[model samples]
Target chain A: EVQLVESGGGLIQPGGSLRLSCAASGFTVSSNYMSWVRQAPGKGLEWVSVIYSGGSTYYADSVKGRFTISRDNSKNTLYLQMNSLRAEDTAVYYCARDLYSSGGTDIWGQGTMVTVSSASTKGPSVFPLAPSSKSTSGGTAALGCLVKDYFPEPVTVSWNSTSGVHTFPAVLQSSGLYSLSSVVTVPSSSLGTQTYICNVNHKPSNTKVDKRVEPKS
Target chain B: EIVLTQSPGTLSLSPGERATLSCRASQSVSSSYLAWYQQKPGQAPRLLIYGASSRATGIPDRFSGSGSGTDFTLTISRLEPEDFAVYYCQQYGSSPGTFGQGTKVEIKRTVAAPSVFIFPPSDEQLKSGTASVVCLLNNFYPREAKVQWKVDNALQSGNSQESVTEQDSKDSTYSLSSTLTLSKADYEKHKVYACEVTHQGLSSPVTKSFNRGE
Candidate 1:
């Protein structure tokens, strides 16, 4: 059960510096090449650099000038250091065991997101109310939409159609955020293959979102 | 009625690069009442630009939207780190406002897949010679990972409580944990419980077996 847990990544401004840490529990640090990889939020993986088993290393040209790879072999640990931070540096950073033999990177850290400053303010998260297919009554499906954790109170919810959208009052969370839930009823056929949309209006952020979901077939 | 169609299902660009998104309508819209939004994983959408070219309150000036009767465009002069996400275009000039499925603005990179782990019961459970098995799903994007349990190579129906879905505050990816209580008697006759995980990013489902006999 080789586990590579990572830590260290938070908001950083341009020209700032930071170090990402990877602590292993079930394997030794110097047995294989320790590699650092990253994916720009919701994108694919880009291999940045790799530290050889002998403590030597190779880094991609993109980050070669600002990136440094170091290790503490006795503690089964490795670190990825970066300076000259920029908006392009914002991403989810990960570390893996680069085999470079006949094996591949079989284990990796869950990764941490580096926003590189500038946001997560005031916007509520939304998910389409998925209808319960088994709970249908007389061909009608009860659909639900969730709008969670936003700042300020005045927000609205609506369905694609003109009626049946029932929005509940905003409730305060322990963390000082707010949440709202809305429900609607429609024919069971309205779901499956196609989807039902949940429209949310948060004027504070000037965001109007339409979330779509299809119940399980 | 107007139906909106967003082009290039995915728009790829990096921070500081300019981005151009399009929304074409089936019919001409009156008042050019179109809207644009930005949505990240697990969170609600925020109105960025609406009323065609008008920027929403608190929106940065870099986002400039413009359009006509049936075609619209949303432009970001220079993308910021927070700008990468899925964007939706909607038309409200007609009855029953319609939305453009969406256009994903991604960074130039590959699929971020979820990791799976199956944990055995604690010593507290061995007291009765039987106990619980835990299955954990971690750090997957798109929030669509599915989990199921099989006892001795056969599917177990509603055998455990529903899985709990959670999001990481730091990474914004989705995760879940599911528990299945088993009996010493059950494993006395069976070899293991298989935890299976399925995600769009994977070519096939992943299965991890936990042999309680160990």
Candidate 2:
């Protein structure tokens, strides 16, 4: 019987660096290539990087430059060092043995849940989708922005970092993703030649969506 | 694509009763890959039979299936105490396989002995010098009831009939009736007319008699 284990759990911050450990028994890590795989919250599996028994290395497109995979033939241990961790790096990382005959990953580690904690730990979509603007005859201008696909609910929203703003509660979608919408109105004259901005404060990150509504020009 | 429909939405029977569940495919099952499963609340479905009539591995011999093309059947020879659950049929012969809505096998409220009541023939019937005696049996279980008519302690026949046993929807019990008709002249022989009823639930039979003198 083959048993694989990956140690190191808990939390990490953005831009931090850490090394994950995978130790094995009943099989030699030097006999076959070992691969690192990860899956984000409510997301598909991602093959991160791999290291060969003979010393060659391969990395997925996104981790090509900073991710490194290394191993020690004597201790039957392997390691993955992430130089710069991002929010999307939050996932359960599994170490697997590449089986040549079945052409698949047969033996896997119990998996190490490395959570790169943050507001956008789920990744980004250009923060605050782009403001949708509309102007009416009451000389009132309305601007709206959506902060979607975020996690860890309850983000704060403001108009020009001020009021006349209506922010809806964060809604969890079926895919385990979340979204929130905010709308604000201002008299035409108050907007002037400057833009109306929607400010969103998601813990650990603050972003903006700016839109200008001219006075019926 | 094939759709399967199961009959008699719910089967209410006490333990030891045979359970027959059916599945009808909307079209021919080209590959004959019909299967049956038993499902209970809070548990995943367990396969009982597959490929039409073959029982699944570890399945008891009493559980069986037989059918072809569009018609299929799953029969449980005698239900065990744990057999009371929903059964579903499925066909994977075509793309996007479908499953029947499912038939629930529920245990009846409880077994009960039949209450037999003998009703004497009306005077209008005696006007013709013949009387039609009606024996009513009600509130029994399992539906396999025995009704016997005797004349002067002898098995009586010829002009004696019994209705099919039915489940009383309100009480979930079995009910049946048997009638004995004979000439009024027979009363002159001093013969006694009796209706004997037997039910699986009872320790002994129930007998009710109708005499012209009484």
Candidate 3:
């Protein structure tokens, strides 16, 4: 049995380096494989890199240049270093363990939230794009909420509906901004007069945007 | 190096419906090289399939996965209430392994919803009249949990201990164990000793009790 724990987080300004650590206990750190996973606000989980027990490491091409993965066997700890941080880099980082014998990532650490601050305080304009609603008789209505142009990548967009709040991962755009979109299906019977609001919370810019619109059946 | 890409960014379906989630690799990913996971908000992801289509131990048959080479799919024949979460595809066959961006599985409707074994004392401890109780936490999740020891109604502390949390081979669930040393007299006292486990998934800690002369 082995346990991995992640610690160290705060704010990192653009161009600054962010250091995160994962400590392992209960098993020989040199005997298993370790990796780092991160989740940007409303974005899918991303693989950062991985280090083997033999002291070798492999990094994702997307992060190959900016990320460094290292380990300290004496301390049973793994470290992740990200240089030249960007607003899009702010995310929840996790340490995971993979068993060669068993395969797949079985163990994960509680995520550490890293926030990236920028010199410019200008925040991106966020609005609901292409809100659509459709339903099958006696079924449910699918409501789409697409929030775009959020900077610094950690914008959280949630929909207020009868079903429940749903959040998606942030998708990086070619313009260096972020886009988030998700759909929540509500019962068709409840869509007649129901209004849905997509709320965006951009932490770096410290701004919040809410767009409300009634579902068109 | 093979890259995995998942499709249909978001899946909106009703419970009991059949859904197929796709994962395409840049190159061939052997059947044994693939795995799938399900992640819910605020919780660690769970392993549902491994070695391509081999279901993790105890995974329901309703959740099936298959594919080889460049294309693979995780098909949930019948979506259950708990099936509404993000799904990810991972490939272990490649170095510096990679995972898909993840596909969110949503239901048209919103719905809500540990073992202990012991080890004996070491030779040094039998002579020193000091021994430790080892409680095993097998097949659990989250890993954010608390393990405690109690002798007779009093909490025991200040003892040398070691704990390891690891992923189970049969399932992705994590397993943990804690060892705490106490005077051998405590072991012979016939007092009730208990190991309590508390996790976010449980409303209350589950405890296992042991007594001397058992």
Candidate 4:
């Protein structure tokens, strides 16, 4: 029954500071451990820091110098502030409950997107490649869509078909761009002339890319 | 800092079956610093075990955890319908603590809820200047819940003692008891003392009330 919602994301210039908030309800915030996690566009998830309801905190080595995690027990709200913003720091930030007994983030907020840039802004071009379809022994087929070479970092990828819609998390490349590949598994019988579409939304560029699957020959 | 790695990435099973999960630390970690958690979809994770083997405040006995010095195991004696979720292991004994990747447990079954009661202090105990009561929650499945106390419908703080949870070995269900000790003066002035219990199985919190006369 516990819930966490994140807010506070906007443009931040280099060397500037930003503070984000995560409000919680349905539980005693003071009695639980809370933490912050960030995902750079297309990159893997990163643990930022953890704070006890009582105010004690521990930060990831990479963020120790610039990240601060704190909470207000009375408000049931957790806050994360970072200084010296950089282009690489732009990512989706989430507040999470660090299970006291277990080490993983048990509960999480939906996430707030933060962008760090200079006076000028640039957007990446999103391209959707052909999907690779494979049939499993269990009579199910897995379809994977690959999207590559996106810029300005953050991009959202999703799939739409006659069956349903599926959203997938993207992976960031070492070169500061993004590439995404995700699989949707359904009954082999479900795959037919039904076309699947890969939808890519790039916020910085304010652009949308949709590629449809051609009918099988 | 030690890194915990969980095995058997995913467990596909049914209710009534036993589940054994493993977590291996990169380096030796004190048993007292290890803990286990269970997370359901869209919900915060619940603490199942801590101090390596001791169950958390409201954890059921079926979710027992143990091990140390780089290896640990969390075992479910008999999985319930609601036990299907993700399991994680964490080590807090070192700097920059870490958690296991996570093991997902999937099953097909149903679950149940708990019954609650409060044991009020006797007249003699109250007259003797002692003011206390116990809130008991019985037979709850999933073993995740919260308990709060209020005096005259207002939040009560600084009076709560420790809360405890016990697993029924025979039925595999859980029972929780939280005790509150108040000032005798407030006990006499207040018309009502209540215990509010919230569990994942219920749509809303259930409140149990007691009065001076009762």
Candidate 5:
């Protein structure tokens, strides 16, 4: 149950490798497995992978290809590395522990926000993923779209506004399974509250998807 | 994607009785954070348990949650049958969290009253009395609705009672009633009292409001 403290935020160059560490203190970190989580700006945290002191590891099936997680039990430190940096990889990354016996994440680090400014200038849109929405002008509103089936590349999601188009990377996952969310700054206007769908452009087809919403107070 | 589904449209139990609920994730949201919420009629949805076992602030010890990575369960060891309402579980694993279908609280069968009294009028007093109305179902199904008394536009609090009995149709129904006693010094004219009945699957909640003139 050691508290995981992530390394200081760093500004890396393009085509460079990024190394981030999670240092533990207080409670013992050897017995429990430590994990890495990622939250694209304005989006919910996603489980990246989990590594044990003994070297065994488990990664989210979708993110396994480009991610790696390792731990040093003696020093109570967990390490994460990503090579061939791309602007798409820039996001706030956090290291967490499995706080719940039911496999839920309880403790999380105060994420390290990495900014790769040197990457490609022409980048994907910045889609904000709104979290639990309260009916108010200041509360968070998350607009999400989960695509069950679709192929091709260059998928994108965003909130279309008259002022400009704010978008987030359209994540094309392993099994044609894609989820993109954007947390839009609640506007004073009524239209700001309406849900904006995730629009995808693919080889065979282009479509719009909206996640189911429940009544909230 | 793996979808988690629940069985039994509604669950019925009495005091000290035990009730079990099942939560199945479509894929395996097991590694994702799972939390349960309880919405008691008009009241805000309260967070019961999060990350599986940790109880939120001020939650009673009687409510317990237990489950693993994929499959989960929420158990109520003692059912004060009146402790009836809808329950739902949500996951925050991916970008946006996904919530499971909800479960309605089960009620015993009871006879339907021709015209049941539902609510007491708002605190706004005209001459003296306020309007009260109720909906009829039948015996055997004692559906519980939110019970609140309002004076004018504000809300009032007091003791409320709900009872269930067998109905002639053999199908269960619920009957609810409440009393509103307002002080002349605090009551206002042209005020309205409303009682709202809410069910998870119901088309829409039924509300009966009374004004001073009536």
Candidate 6:
């Protein structure tokens, strides 16, 4: 029987931070990546982020800086901590096993209930997405781009070979709103410090890209 | 904030291929809860990944997962034809236990495009003098549904030689029927007549056929 027994109980909070745990047994926890998630009263579930025993982590774009996850493979335990809890943060917390939650966190720990009340809170701050990398070339590239604020119109991306500055091509599209990828062909022989720009002309011209190899992808 | 949003319902995918989906949340699902499901044909959802890599009980070895906290993936190595129906990923890493809208892996459609209609091919050939086989598409979305008929199982490009008439049912969502009539002689061919429909929610395509034998 695979079960992720979690630490639970509601607290009459005075407006502070909280910590929850999803303890594992019956299976070897070290081989699995421990992930945490939350579900609100009436809304759907949100994927927070995950942490592996090796200290590697994945964060949802929104909860990056504020959320932290850690695990003790030896003890078969995983922990989740969110700082400066607020009313919006009130929801049921759960721990699941992806061991390295790759695609979707399907295996789930029952869940732990938490409430954030009785305190003045500050608005959330932004943090750079955790460091990441990308391989130089591949036949089909999946560049995850998001653009939903604009309706009817689709998103677009382009490529330019700058003489003084080689412009890298980004995989993205225009007009088709929502976060989607641009599948293109590329030879494995090309890569290195060329700027591949991904820009969205929404109000602020929302755009992001890779200037150089980051995580050695 | 990063929010991962998934369509609330299920997505139908073709078996044997990769079903690429998302786990969108109010923010992102990094060090968050990420799980994938397999709702076999008509059964309930079964977990395929939790925390990211761990598979559930009775899950086929063909299933696997990858990625980090926020962006991750649940991949079924090989999708058997029987592995049809809906699939969903619930992010437990955040609040409100949101699912990546469900994905239904169902049967692939039969045809590539619409087929030509053969209303007996000739009117004078039928014992009743007129030949007619009505092609109807019900419960179809007006934005993406279209039907075509086939004569002798061959693709019909246009209504060039035959008489074509159509009537859309009220409520719009109910059904739309198209009647093709011809001289009695056309009915004597006794060839198979088929209808094909193309829609937004399908994998390959869908087709329907009818003959005197059936």
Model 4 scores a C-alpha lDDT of 0.67
Most accurate candidate by DockQ:
3
Candidate with the larger DockQ of 2 and 5: 5
Sort by lDDT, best first: 1, 3, 4, 2, 5, 6
Give me the runs in candidate 2 sitting further than 4 Å from their true place: A101-103, A118-217, B1-214
| RMSD to the hidden true structure, all candidates | 23.3, 31.8, 24.7, 27.1, 19.8, 25.5
> Which candidate's TM-score is highest?
3
Which lDDT values do the candidates have, in the order given?
0.68, 0.64, 0.67, 0.67, 0.51, 0.48
TM-score of chain A of 2: 0.53
What DockQ, on C-alphas, does every prediction get? Answer: 0.01, 0.01, 0.08, 0.04, 0.03, 0.06
- TM-score: the better of candidates 1 and 5: 1
The native-contact fraction of candidate 4 is 0.10
Q: Give lDDT tens digits, candidate 6, residues B1-214.
A: 3344554344444445665555555556656457677654212245776666667667788788665556666666655655654566666554334566555454343222222211211121244464545443333332235667676777765431211111112222223334344445665566677667666545656666655422
Ranking by TM-score: 3, 4, 1, 5, 6, 2
For TM-score, candidate 3 versus 6, the one ahead is: 3
- Which lDDT tens digits does candidate 2 get at residues A1-217? 6767787654577888889888998889887877887756544345688766677887878899899988888999988999788877887787877543111344667766676654344521212221112122255544445455565433556666554444444445444655554545456456556566665665433333343222322
TM-score of each: 0.37, 0.31, 0.51, 0.47, 0.35, 0.34
* Candidate 1 segments whose C-alpha is farther than 4 A from its true place: A1-217, B8-19, B39-44, B76-86, B94-98, B104-115, B121-132, B140-188, B194-214
lDDT of 1 by residue, A1-217 (tens): 6768898876666778989999998778787877787767545345677877777777767898799988888888989999998889888787877434211344678777665644344777775444443324456665656576686545677777444334555555555666665656577776675567878887756788887755632
Tens digit of lDDT per residue, candidate 3, span A63-144? 8878998877889888898998887888888888886522378778777778787634345453332222212224544444
Binned by DockQ into CAPRI classes (incorrect, acceptable, medium, high), candidate 2 is incorrect
Better of 1 and 5 by DockQ: 5
Interface RMSD of 1: 21.9
Docking class of 1: incorrect
lDDT (Cα) of model 3: 0.67
Stretches off by above 4 angstroms in model 3 are: A100-103, A119-217, B1-3, B42-44, B57-61, B110-214
DockQ of 1: 0.01
